[PDB]
């Protein structure tokens, strides 16, 4: 086969290490440790990682390398009745890009905003603050931090949106950042993985540089140890609570991202007899390693806020963009050489997102190249049209009420969509295709069959591991709300369409492939359950 292949082996490694390590390593794993019994949280985290995630992480990386094709084709050549999986997985990757790149633009607008000596978000006597302001985070909502009013009232101007319907003015300073993002994408992966494979060196290694700097300045700070205590001081009571084994199980899933079509796409250019098993374990480790490390960077600074700046930690130990955009920038502002910690930090946050946004694009570009060769013969040109659809719709997220539109996509674009999709991937591979077939495939590739441990995690554990999350994840349904803004019933119904528009293509192309073929039913499933390689 004249397929392409990674210019170097590190280009595949750093392309995967970068897709996996993003802001959720910096902002949701330290919170989960802090909230759920400290270091003791590492137990259910590691258990849910050992039996549920890395099993799944391994399974996809091996498939992608072996079946050598992108996400759509690789499920047609494996179980044709379930070719719809590849279609679902790809537009989910299409939907996410409608908001994921915005979070990078926020970083870039803060990076551009950190070119000064008095960082704007530190003082509360500016044109955008309110009389109900505090210089640092508190626990009353009418009174927000000076670094949180700079975010909601100047950077986002969310105070000028009465809801989802009131998008209000397009803010072009943010639009110009969203373009700088999609341009940073295009010229880094238009010509192929010949160049994307190299681009990821800066964007995947630079965070580790900024981490080591911020890990030193964080740890060499008055009150730095007090943070490390709140991070890891073990309370094994939380072990008992099953609400913690869901938070471990759900964080392991989205932090590694198996069954997303990316690792499959990235492996499809791997050389056949490459030891993917080694790559799976080495890659997965550097992931959870970076999150454990990153909690030290965050919570060293987070302890310094409590001891020096006089805040209750439960008021600064937050998750999500509030931490990287309000809380941590607020403590940077108090440190000497603050303009330096600002720039590396936001240039960290940006690079943390780019590698991961690269993977989403490629899973779409590769799945389409490997099926509609008009796309393949016209790569450079195709991507232009793709990223422009992103930018144009993305202008809806650069308005004043932009956040409300993002929050909807954060919840529905790829929420319950992907969880069922991967459940059908585990079922399609461990059961319909066959671990019998699958292990025989791997042995031909790397030289040995997967240990009976892996086979068992693939066939039973992972399906009930995914089931564990979707069940305990539907039990906690609440209508979409931000602050007091209750999203209207038609906005959820809309978000249900984009959540359905993925999963529906599983029984759709199951039905369409059934009806489009000749024979009798057991002759029907047999013809649609025997793979191409067979």
């Amino acid at each position: 086969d004249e397929r392409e292949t990674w210019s170097g082996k590190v280009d595949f490694l750093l392309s995967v290490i970068g897709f996996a390590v993003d802001l959720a390593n910096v902002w949701r794993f330290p919170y989960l440790c802090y909230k759920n019994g400290g270091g003791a949280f590492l137990v259910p985290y590691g258990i849910m990682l050992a039996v549920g995630g890395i099993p799944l992480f391994y399974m996809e990386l091996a498939l992608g390398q072996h079946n050598r094709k992108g996400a759509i084709t690789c499920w047609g050549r494996l179980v044709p009745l379930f070719k719809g999986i590849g279609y679902a997985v790809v537009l989910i990757a299409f939907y996410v890009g409608f908001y994921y790149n915005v979070i990078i633009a926020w970083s870039l607008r803060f990076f551009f905003a950190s070119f000064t000596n008095s960082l704007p978000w530190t003082s509360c006597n500016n044109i955008w603050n309110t009389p109900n302001c505090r210089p640092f985070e508190g626990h009353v909502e009418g009174f927000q931090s000076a670094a949180s009013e700079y975010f909601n009232r100047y950077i986002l101007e969310l105070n000028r949106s009465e809801g989802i319907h009131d998008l209000g003015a397009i803010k072009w300073d943010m639009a110009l950042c969203l373009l700088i993002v999609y341009l940073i994408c295009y010229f880094s992966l238009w010509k192929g993985i010949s160049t994307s494979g190299k681009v990821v060196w800066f964007t995947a290694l630079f965070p580790y540089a900024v981490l080591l700097i911020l890990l030193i300045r964080g740890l060499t700070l008055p009150g730095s140890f007090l943070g490390i205590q709140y991070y890891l001081t073990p309370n094994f009571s939380a072990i008992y609570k099953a609400e913690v084994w869901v938070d471990a199980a759900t964080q392991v899933f989205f932090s590694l991202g198996p069954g997303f079509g990316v690792l499959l796409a990235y492996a499809s250019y791997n050389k056949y007899h490459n030891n993917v098993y080694k790559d799976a374990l080495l890659t997965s480790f550097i992931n959870s390693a970076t999150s454990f490390i990153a909690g030290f960077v965050i919570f060293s600074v987070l302890g310094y806020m409590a001891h020096t700046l006089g805040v209750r930690i439960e008021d600064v130990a937050t998750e999500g963009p509030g931490l990287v955009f309000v809380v941590y920038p607020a403590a940077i502002a108090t440190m000497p050489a603050s303009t330096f910690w600002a720039l590396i930090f936001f240039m960290m946050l940006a690079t943390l997102g780019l590698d991961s946004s690269f993977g989403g694009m490629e899973a779409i570009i590769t799945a389409l190249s490997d099926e509609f060769p008009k796309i393949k013969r016209n790569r450079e040109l195709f991507v232009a049209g793709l990223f422009s659809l992103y930018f144009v719709v993305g202008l809806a997220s650069c308005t004043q009420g932009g956040f409300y539109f993002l929050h909807l996509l954060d919840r529905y674009a790829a929420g319950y969509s992907i969880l069922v999709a991967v459940f059908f991937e585990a079922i399609a591979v461990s059961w319909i295709y066959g671990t019998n077939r699958f292990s025989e495939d791997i042995r031909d590739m790397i030289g040995f069959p997967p240990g009976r441990y892996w086979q068992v995690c693939w066939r039973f554990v992972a399906p009930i591991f995914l089931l564990f999350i979707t069940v305990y994840g539907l039990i906690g349904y609440e209508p979409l709300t931000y602050a007091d803004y209750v999203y209207p019933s038609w906005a959820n119904a809309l978000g249900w369409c984009i959540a359905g528009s993925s999963v529906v293509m599983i029984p759709a192309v199951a039905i369409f492939k059934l009806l489009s073929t000749p024979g009798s039913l057991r002759q029907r499933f047999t013809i649609l359950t025997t793979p191409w390689r067979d």
């Epitope: 019998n436 077939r437 292990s439 025989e440 042995r443 031909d444 030289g447 040995f448 069959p449």
Partner: antibody
Framework: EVQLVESGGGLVKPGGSLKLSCAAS????????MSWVRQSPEKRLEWVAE????????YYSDTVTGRFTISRDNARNILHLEMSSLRSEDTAMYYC????????????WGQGTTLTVSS | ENVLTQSPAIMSTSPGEKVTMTCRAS???????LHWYQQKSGASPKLWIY???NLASGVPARFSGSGSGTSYSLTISSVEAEDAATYYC?????????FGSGTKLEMKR
Amino acid sequence: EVQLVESGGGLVKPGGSLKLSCAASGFTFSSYAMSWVRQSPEKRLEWVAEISSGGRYIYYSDTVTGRFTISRDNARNILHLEMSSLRSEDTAMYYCARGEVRQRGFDYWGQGTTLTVSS
Amino acid sequence: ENVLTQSPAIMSTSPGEKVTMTCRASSSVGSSYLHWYQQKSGASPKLWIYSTSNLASGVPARFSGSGSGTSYSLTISSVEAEDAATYYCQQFSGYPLTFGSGTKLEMKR
């Protein structure tokens, strides 16, 4: 324990066609790739064919390719080898060697069966 | 094809002595794939050393194995006469799989 038994084979006229059989017992024959290794009367070992466990990956030596066929009956636990256009340099004792892990080699070897090709 | 040659061809040794045999590949071979088989006069071969150094179950600890790249060796510390055999190396990295010429260890008297 694990044990393999090669069977069939004897005298064959050149150009003829003989089929050998290796009866596995003492382990899950379905889980292990087998391979056929032959040894000439000059005591030099030579690999012939390999078949994956499910039988969907089959590698031939460049010598025997197109002439031999290594099939595999995971029902009855029998490994096969179908020979056609038999030449005289095919004369050897044929071994049925169990190897699944390349990094471990051929775990177990059968007694062997003797092919003599001579007009 | 990856041609393997072993030396010496024949080797007479007094029991208790130390013997070394070498296996040299025409193409390079990854260390994890070169194995060693012991075959007694008129018996089926037996897997002896797998992946350069690891002895197989039943192989006395008097046997060692080393090497890398294009040159590997099998070394017997102190031989007894129950080790008179012919020893073959084998590579499992690429197809066709190839066996070496073998060394015939004979007892000296």
